Design a protein around this nucleic acid. Structure first.
Lengths: 185, 321, 50, 1105, 68, 182
RNA sequence: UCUCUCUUUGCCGGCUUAGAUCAA
RNA sequence: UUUUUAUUAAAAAAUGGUAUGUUUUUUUU
């Protein structure tokens, strides 16, 4: 479909990209996409129209009158999100990830480990839970005070966040922010 | 340096304090021609704590080729091999389970059918080799061979940092494929051999000729590799339908599938949040289902490479059998 | 020649733009009372210190 | 007129157009230009090349612009007559401009305008005028020398030196390199600067630059500590400081914008100076605000301290109490910078004092206007709070004197309590009993004997003789008119003269060159044998203290009445009546008014959040004060009603039937706005004849905001504990904590949690804050309350909770039962969801579901540059989602007025227009869904009849090719699937699909037909059984009928609630067949499926995790 | 008046007060009630003068549109 | 990113832009210099660049005036500067230089600032950096942009009217040519 | 009295909240 | 000392969101 002329994007990432153009035009269409018009022209119908097909049932002529199918009544958006929304099955991926048959595999390996054996790669896998460094020196001890780490409709993606947009009903941080004892002396 | 995560099949570039041996080598680097001084930006007390020598790459790489090698020699029990340093057991079992789900290993852990032994004979990884070995059943070995040669050789596009980047985009503008980067690479390779190996053409199109030559050597050697099994290598698809090439790829990249999320990221089949790299054409096309090859992980986002679109019913029919 | 806008380009040299102001007519002088004020503050400050 | 214009033409030429409030300026300019052209044409003599008008007009425009920006505008080559004429016309235009500014500002203050443009224009005019006045003031200061004389400066310096040496004050040193607490002070300052922003994308260049600098500080702090100290030592000149005004519609707050790096340095210096001053005891307890209490507890402490004075309420021997509230009129404007520098040199190092003095002499610039601030005090600096706090301790020394200040504060090593003295001998030795200074307001309490008061009045009347007795005509400037008289001040001659004498004496106490006291801001309230009640106004509260001695009246001890006890007798001795001052009511009204007109108020959720925040900020400050004020209650009703009216207007219909309280008050997770409510209460009334002269009993109740039907929306105040109970609980809990701490110290045990679980969240400084993770960093953050108060001069956004900080005080309000109570009040979750479109989604149960805030598509376009129409639509998206969610109730059938129009190609019946709902419903049916759904349902029906193709009535069966528009036409409906019988049967009156005791042996019928009609039910009428019953009894009995068989079967489907039913004559086998098949159908059609999924997509209501 | 008033005339035979201004409209204030009763509208620009005929009940206005 | 050291090319583009635009459009001027912000442009113009500043050597009369004023008003350089005639930064720098020179002569016949490093200079008060022979490549492109900028004029959308007139001229000439060839 | 050249030579779009904002 | 009564509303157009400007001849001699 020629994917339209692609040279318009060039670099210039998100916060400088002009606006999306459905037909190389700065406009929106659809009620939930930001356009003030939905459907053909604020209407349900289509350009050509729509008519039902002829009907005839005589215990042998209704056999030609087949049933209804998913695709024949949907549109391009509907099929696109139908493709997007199909997620199920999985099974085998969940079983061997994140051992089961691998235990039988260890039976094949003749593990006989008793006490397990570890490698300095696992000390580097611990490094996955240590740091990535913060541009500091080797001996830098750093400081502990300088380290840091409900629903409904939205206020609008352009209306931003502030003190205004937090949960007035709060019951979080039960005990994780509080000590269990304090020195008295 | 680079550390790979087996649980997530990712790889990350992390900063590590140097070893004592590396510090000694760096100190001795200066002083070859005349007397020289070194100024290491730390204290001797800091030097007193680092580990002496950097760990081996046999302890810092993917052992799946190693397991293929040992299994090809005929070692049923991996523990019998005399490793200088014992590799992580969890890595070995992860690699073996990956190989099992790939089909190269049976339930007993032995090579499965001619497939397992033929994969063991291949220099490449088992994932890429599966597509090549299964391409014989579908009569389209040529294009999958080109894909493998491009993948193993590396990046076939050159990206300048000056204003010629726009010129590079225009140079690439002739070969943008709607179906992903993989078919774009196939088209580029086809017209590359169709352009008389002209070096001026490679300059004009900003194309890395060295990578293409190396891909040529790779494909010739893999042609010899298939002919070792008496597999003909004149099989091409006369039809424009790349669907069955995609079936072979999905047989080769079973684990590497993902579908778009509303937030702009993609959900892997394994429930992993990944982000598409900016280099790929399908950066914002919002393709519903995607398939990648390699994952490189940064401190916040997991980026995927070699992006190619797929259709859901192929995946459904492949998983059920 | 305005300091704010001009519909055409009409570049004006800096000397003419500088000449269009009333800066010179506005004097810049300080009262005499500051001299006695500051000195008194300096005198008592030293006295209290001693 | 229409036909004349049709057959004749426009006749546009030769018609006049009246000036209509939008052409006023453009016509005034035209008239002025014409007048200037005439003057030019006249004063230029004959034969002098008259073609020179345009250049003089350009000169006039430039002169006007120079006047607006306060620039001299001297043109060298201009002739004298032209210059004089231009000056005259510029002055005329300027006077017109200023008059319009005055008129518009008065209108805005009253509240008669709602334009954003008019408010912004008038804000600009006020800023320009104020800056002109300020530039003139600074120039006059330079011309006329230092207003404070040398003698006054010497006296002030001497008194301050004596005071500081009496309390052995150790001057603050420059922070050394090896300072233990530098990192903690730095992180505190950095957090206070980060608190100003969010993760939003509206950060401009300055905001982004300061955020990047802050991040760089966090990554590596020590070189920035070095840089901060180096800049403190070396820097003495600074960048320009932007200035702008924040509109409160009744006064303008000056907001100063400072360079980011200088902001970091100022914040660190502020933190360091406040920590060092508190560690060295520089401020003697009576300066306010303080870290000890919030303002309401300060008012409570003042009431208790007044009540606890010895023989305070006794008036036998002519003793009098005068409690004088006043404000230092213009005291920030008269802070001499050199005197300030010399004074600041006393407290701290010369480098710090010099830095702080030079930081105040900056160049203030608004737009094209600029001037050098050389006389006033710049309040936008981060350490301006401290600078003002110790300059105002000087004025406290001037007012009190050294001996009285020493008596009040006590020895430096053993300072007195807040409002207590060491002993009664020193307490009663001076007329001044109590004293405090809240920033710039001064509250003093005088305790005069008879001789002292008589001598004071005699002295005052010597110098200000009053022969005509005019001292009583203007005493209370309507300040205390809120109280019913007989609770105000009785204007006896002696009491009035005593109050004015006290004011005269205190005003004479202070030099005029640095501050002054205005009678229009002062109100001294006297307690004597003539009037029994003390009145005063602290912060936002109006307090009236009536001792039990002078009561002689029985009143109900309201929740808004504080009982004052006496520590000598441990019994209640007076009652303090608390209410919100008129300024507080105006502040809340203006806050709501500026909420309504704002950039973000487009979305319903945003305005609901704004309303919730404003309401909480009001009702947590004046907890029970806002209850005792009957004016604030009606203001709350009015403002909540107009907040609702904004939402009503945004959907182009403000009918009350369309918006039941479930739309506004249901919690956010259920799809409502989550609005907190207080206007739903009865407002007490009493007879108006005696309401102004006495406090009569509440004899009548006027309804507040009305709820259609029986609904009891919970009050917000009922989930906030009143201030008095909080204070009593705080005292008890802290006393018991001290006892338990002592019992923990006597042994070697470590005090722990689960030992204070009973008094967990209690005490004004909450007990929680004891076992806080970051209590060690917070132990160094001092003077935070004054800093939070002064933060209004640095940020253009209003801080609602300026009086408290959650880190230091704890969460003082805990409103979580409000959610469950308002769910119960509206009728439960099921009762709420019957209004929404939950059923149409087809979801099995509500428990698992959750909302998605942003559609991802919105997140894609939140940075891209878009046209104004695109931004408006992107803002309208959540409104459209909300309207779709509440479709059954907004598009209801029981409406007052409204043309009943059918949406084309669709069976939905629209009352009114409501464009948002129409466009949402069109999107939900963007293809021919209604008729496609009808055909799919009938198609699935014919298939299941093809299955059971061997039954009764099987002689003939046929579904006709109906008229296309037979899905969306309820005026009449043609036939559907036909059945004719091979034999004769007995059937009776048609029945529903619910009865088993159904008689079918009354009549004798032969043939029947079955048809289906689609209905999009609303909230009011959705019971499908009656609908199908009536449709069958109307269609079959109708004289015209295109149904072949006289009797048949009619079935219906309610699309909005996905229900179904049927009504028709029954033949055995057919009824169970449809019963078993309809349920299987309703979960299987591609059409119903896609409709449900597209509804779910529009609602963004996703399934479980 | 919206803009500057340029001409007044107290009628000597009626209890009226006619006025005109640069805001293009002419008014007839009724002095028995101090309220405007009559409006004279036709004028393409500001009105600069106003006069009353001594005998007839006719008034004459002159303005910026070069027309009396 | 933003800021730097105010190379000579930037300063001269600033001077030209002030000449073409005025002293009240610092946002439009800063659009020329991509590495500077309007506040930075204003600060440099009012502190180093505008011709009113006397960069000459300090005379004795103004030196004695500076000493007297600095005695009268401690700190407060933004108000001392207009009276003396120089900028605030110049006055403060001259005062510090005189104090340091006196200390130097103090040593011939005979710490608080010493304990920390030297004062980082203010970017807007330092002299412009002399240009190199080959000013990178980015500075060339911004100079070209500024050159096209200064001689644009003719508004923004006035390029449509003349273009339509030229197109109409071409169309009419073609029409007349077809008539003539017929 | 012509021709050329130079020099002398007095000289022939508006308004408002600068309308409002601006990071690769 | 026995009883009360009191009930605002309410929808349409333009701003506001498929700009706009262009566009075919019967006589020469």
């Amino acid at each position: 479909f020629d994917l339209e002329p692609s040279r318009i994007n060039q670099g210039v990432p998100v916060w400088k990209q002009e606006a999306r153009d459905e037909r190389n035009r700065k406009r929106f269409h659809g009620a939930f996409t930001g356009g003030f018009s939905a459907g053909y022209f604020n209407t349900v119908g289509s350009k050509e129209g729509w008519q039902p097909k002829s009907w005839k049932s005589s215990r042998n002529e209704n056999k030609s009158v087949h049933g209804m199918t998913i695709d024949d009544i949907m549109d391009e958006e509907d099929r696109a999100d139908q493709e997007l929304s199909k997620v199920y099955t999985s099974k085998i991926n969940t079983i061997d990830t994140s051992d089961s048959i691998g235990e039988k595999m260890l039976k094949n390996l003749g593990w006989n480990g008793h006490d397990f054996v570890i490698s300095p790669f696992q000390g580097y896998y611990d490094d996955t839970k240590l740091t990535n460094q913060a541009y500091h020196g080797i001996g830098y001890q750093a400081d502990d005070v300088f380290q840091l780490e409900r629903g409904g409709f939205g206020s609008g993606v352009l209306n931003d966040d502030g003190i205004e947009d937090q949960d007035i009903y709060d019951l979080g941080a039960p005990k994780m922010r509080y000590d269990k004892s304090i020195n008295i002396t | 340096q680079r550390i790979y995560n087996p649980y997530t099949r990712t790889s990350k570039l992390i900063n590590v304090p140097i070893s004592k041996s590396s510090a000694i080598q760096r100190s001795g680097r200066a002083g070859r021609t005349m007397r020289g001084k070194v100024f290491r930006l730390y204290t001797e007390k800091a030097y007193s704590l680092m580990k002496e020598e950097f760990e081996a790459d046999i302890l810092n790489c993917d052992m799946s080729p190693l397991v293929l090698f040992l299994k090809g020699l005929g070692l049923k029990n991996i523990l019998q091999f005399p490793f200088f340093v014992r590799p992580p057991t969890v890595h070995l079992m992860a690699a073996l389970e990956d190989l099992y789900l790939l089909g190269v290993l049976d339930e007993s852990g032995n090579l499965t059918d001619p497939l397992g032994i033929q994969i063991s004979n291949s220099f490449l990884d088992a994932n890429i080799s599966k597509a090549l070995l299964t391409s014989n059943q579908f009569g389209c070995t040529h294009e999958i061979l080109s894909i493998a040669s491009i993948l193993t050789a590396g990046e076939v596009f050159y990206n300048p940092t000056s204003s010629s980047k726009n010129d590079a985009f225009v140079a690439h503008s002739s070969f943008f494929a709607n179906e992903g980067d993989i078919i774009t690479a196939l088209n580029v390779f086809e017209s590359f051999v169709g352009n008389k190996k002209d070096l001026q053409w490679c300059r004009k199109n900003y194309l890395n000729y060295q990578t293409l030559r190396q891909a040529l050597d790779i494909r010739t050697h893999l042609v010899r590799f298939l002919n070792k099994f008496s597999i003909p290598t004149a099989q091409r698809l006369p039809s424009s339908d790349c669907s069955k090439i995609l079936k072979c790829l999905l047989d080769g990249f079973v684990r590497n599938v993902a579908h778009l999320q509303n937030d702009g990221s993609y959900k892997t089949i394994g429930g992993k949040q990944v982000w598409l790299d900016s280099s790929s054409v399908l950066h914002e096309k919002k393709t519903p289902w995607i398939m990648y090859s390699s994952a490189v992980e940064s401190e916040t986002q997991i980026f995927v490479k070699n992006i190619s679109k797929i259709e859901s019913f192929w995946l459904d029919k492949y998983y059920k059998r | 020649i305005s300091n704010w806008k001009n519909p055409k380009g009409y570049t004006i040299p800096l000397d003419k733009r500088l000449a269009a102001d009333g800066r010179g007519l506005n004097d810049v002088e300080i009262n005499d009372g500051f001299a006695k004020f500051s000195e008194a503050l300096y005198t008592v400050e030293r006295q209290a210190r001693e | 007129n229409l036909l004349a214009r049709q057959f004749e033409g426009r006749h546009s030429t030769g018609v006049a157009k009246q000036i209509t409030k939008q052409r006023v300026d453009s016509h005034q300019d035209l008239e002025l230009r014409a007048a200037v052209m005439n003057d030019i044409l006249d004063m230029i003599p004959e034969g002098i090349r008259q073609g020179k008008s345009k250049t003089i007009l350009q000169h006039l425009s430039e002169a006007w612009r120079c006047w607006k920006a306060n620039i001299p505008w001297k043109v060298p080559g201009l002739p004298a007559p032209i210059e004089n004429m231009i000056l005259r016309y510029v002055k005329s235009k300027a006077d017109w401009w200023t008059s319009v500014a005055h008129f518009n500002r008065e209108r805005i203050r009253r509240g008669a305008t709602v334009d954003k443009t008019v408010a912004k224009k008038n804000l600009g005019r006020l800023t320009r005028l104020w800056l002109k006045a300020e530039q003139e003031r600074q120039h006059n200061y330079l011309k006329d020398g230092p207003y404070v004389t040398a003698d006054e400066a010497v006296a002030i310096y001497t008194t301050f030196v004596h005071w500081l040496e009496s309390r052995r004050f150790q001057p603050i040193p420059f922070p050394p390199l090896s300072y233990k607490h530098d990192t903690k002070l730095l992180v505190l300052a950095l957090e206070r600067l980060k608190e100003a922003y969010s993760v939003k994308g509206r950060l401009n260049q300055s905001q982004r630059e300061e955020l990047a600098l802050v991040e760089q500080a966090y990554d590596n702090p020590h070189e920035m500590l070095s840089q901060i100290k180096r800049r403190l030592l070396t820097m003495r000149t600074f960048k320009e400081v932007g200035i702008e005004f924040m509109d409160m519609y009744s006064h303008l707050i000056p907001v100063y914008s400072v360079d980011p790096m200088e902001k970091i340095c100022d914040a660190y210096l502020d933190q360091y100076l406040w920590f060092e001053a508190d560690r060295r005891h520089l401020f003697p307890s009576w300066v306010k605000p303080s870290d000890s209490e919030p303002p309401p507890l300060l008012v409570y402490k003042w009431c208790q301290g007044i009540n606890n004075l010895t023989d305070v309420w006794e008036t036998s021997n002519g003793e009098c109490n005068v409690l004088m509230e006043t404000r230092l009129s213009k005291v920030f404007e008269k802070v001499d910078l050199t005197l300030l520098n010399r004074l600041m040199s006393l407290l701290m190092d010369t480098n710090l004092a010099s830095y702080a003095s030079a930081k105040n002499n900056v160049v203030l610039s608004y737009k094209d206007m600029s001037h050098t601030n050389s006389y006033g005090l710049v309040r936008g600096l981060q350490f301006s709070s401290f600078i003002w706090q110790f300059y105002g301790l000087v004025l406290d020394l001037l007012i009190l004197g050294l001996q009285r200040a020493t008596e009040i504060a006590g020895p430096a090593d053993a300072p007195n309590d807040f409002l207590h003295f060491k002993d009664q001998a020193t307490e009663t030795s001076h007329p001044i009993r109590l004293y405090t200074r809240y920033i710039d307001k001064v509250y003093i309490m005088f305790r005069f004997t008879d001789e002292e008061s008589r001598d004071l009045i005699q002295r005052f009347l010597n110098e200000n003789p009053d022969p005509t007795n005019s001292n009583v005509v203007n005493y209370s400037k309507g300040k205390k008119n809120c109280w019913p008289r007989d609770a105000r001040m009785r204007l006896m001659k002696h009491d009035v003269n005593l109050g004015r004498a006290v004011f005269w004496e205190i005003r004479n106490r202070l030099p005029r060159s640095l501050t002054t006291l205005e009678w229009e801001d002062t109100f001294p309230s006297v307690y004597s044998k003539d009037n029994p009640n003390l009145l005063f106004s602290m912060t936002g509260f109006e307090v009236r203290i009536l001792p039990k001695i002078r009561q002689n009246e029985e009143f109900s001890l309201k929740d808004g009445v504080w009982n004052l006890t006496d520590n000598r007798t441990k019994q209640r001795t007076a009652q303090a009546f608390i209410r919100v001052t008129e300024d507080g009511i105006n502040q809340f009204g203006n806050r709501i008014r500026q909420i309504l007109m704002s950039s973000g108020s487009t979305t319903f959720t945003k305005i609901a959040n704004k309303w919730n925040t404003a309401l909480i900020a009001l009702m947590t400050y004046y907890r029970e004060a806002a209850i005792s004020t009957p004016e604030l209650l009606d203001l709350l009703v009015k403002c909540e009603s107009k907040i609702q009216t904004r939402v009503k207007i945004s959907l182009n219909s403000k009918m009350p039937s369309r918006f039941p309280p479930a739309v506004f008050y249901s919690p956010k997770e259920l799809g409502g706005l989550g609005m907190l409510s207080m206007g739903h209460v009865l407002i007490p009334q009493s007879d108006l004849r005696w309401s102004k002269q006495t406090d009569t009993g509440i004899t009548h109740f006027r309804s507040g905001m009305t709820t259609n039907g029986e609904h009891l929306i919970p009050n917000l105040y009922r989930y906030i504990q009143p201030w008095e109970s909080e204070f009593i609980d705080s005292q008890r809990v802290w006393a018991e904590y001290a006892m338990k701490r002592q019992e923990a110290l006597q042994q070697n045990r470590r005090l722990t949690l689960e030992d204070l679980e009973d008094s967990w969240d209690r005490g004004i400084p909450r007990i929680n804050t004891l076992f806080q993770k970051d209590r060690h960093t917070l132990a160094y953050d001092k003077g935070w309350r004054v800093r939070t108060e002064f933060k209004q001069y640095q940020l253009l956004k209003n801080n609602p909770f300026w009086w408290t900080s959650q880190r230091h005080d704890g969460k003082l309000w805990q409103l979580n039962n409000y959610r469950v109570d308002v769910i119960q009040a509206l009728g439960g979750v099921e009762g709420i969801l019957e209004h929404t479109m939950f059923k149409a989604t087809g979801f099995p149960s509500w428990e698992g579901l959750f909302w998605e805030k942003a559609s991802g598509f919105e997140e894609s376009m939140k940075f891209k540059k878009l046209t104004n129409a695109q931004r408006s639509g992107l803002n309208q998206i959540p409104n459209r989602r909300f309207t779709l969610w509440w479709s059954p109730t907004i598009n209801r059938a029981n409406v007052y007025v409204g043309f009943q129009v059918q949406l084309d190609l669709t069976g939905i019946m629209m009352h009114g227009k409501i464009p948002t709902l129409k466009i949402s419903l069109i999107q939900i049916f963007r293809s021919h869904l209604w008729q496609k759904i009808h055909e799919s349902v009938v198609w699935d029906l014919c298939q299941v009849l093809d299955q059971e193709l061997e039954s009764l009535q099987i002689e003939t069966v046929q579904k006709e090719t109906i008229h296309p528009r037979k899905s969306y036409k309820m005026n009449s409906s043609c036939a559907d699937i036909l059945l004719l019988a091979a034999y004769k049967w007995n059937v009776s009156r048609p029945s529903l699909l619910n009865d088993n005791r159904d008689v079918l042996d009354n009549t004798t019928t032969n043939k029947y037909w079955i048809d289906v009609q689609l209905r999009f039910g609303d909230y009011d009428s959705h019971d499908i059984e009656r609908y199908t019953r009536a449709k069958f009894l109307d269609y079959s009995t109708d004289a015209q009928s295109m149904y072949p068989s006289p009797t048949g079967v009619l079935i219906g489907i309610d699309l909005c609630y996905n229900m179904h039913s049927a009504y028709g004559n029954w033949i055995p086998g057919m009824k169970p067949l449809i019963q078993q098949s309809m349920n299987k159908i309703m979960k299987a059609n591609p059409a119903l499926y896609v409709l449900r999924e597209r509804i779910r997509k529009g609602l963004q209501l996703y399934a479980s995790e | 008046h919206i803009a500057t008033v340029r001409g007044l005339a107290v009628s000597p035979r009626h209890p009226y007060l006619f006025s005109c201004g640069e805001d293009k409209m002419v008014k007839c204030w009724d002095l028995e009630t101090n309220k405007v009763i009559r409006h004279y509208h036709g004028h393409l620009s500001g009105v600069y003068a106003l006069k009353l005929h001594p005998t007839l009940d006719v008034l004459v206005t002159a303005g910026r549109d070069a027309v009396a | 990113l933003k800021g730097g050291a105010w190379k000579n090319t930037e300063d001269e583009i600033l001077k030209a832009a002030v000449s073409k635009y005025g002293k009240n459009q610092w946002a439009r001027i800063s659009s020329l210099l991509v590495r500077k912000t309007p506040k930075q442009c204003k600060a440099r113009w009012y502190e180093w660049i505008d011709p009113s500043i006397k960069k000459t050597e300090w005379s004795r009369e103004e030196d004695e005036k500076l000493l007297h004023l600095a005695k009268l008003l401690p700190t407060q350089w933004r108000t001392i500067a207009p009276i003396v005639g120089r900028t605030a930064t110049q006055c403060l720098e001259r005062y510090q230089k005189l104090l340091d020179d006196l200390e130097a002569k103090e040593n011939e016949q005979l710490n608080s600032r010493l304990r920390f490093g030297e004062a980082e200079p203010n970017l807007e008060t330092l002299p412009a950096l002399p240009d190199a022979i080959d000013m990178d490549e980015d500075e060339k492109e911004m100079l070209s942009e500024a050159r096209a900028r200064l001689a644009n004029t003719q508004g923004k959308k006035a390029k449509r009217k003349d273009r339509e007139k030229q197109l109409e001229l071409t169309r009419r000439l073609s029409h007349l040519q077809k008539r003539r060839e017929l």
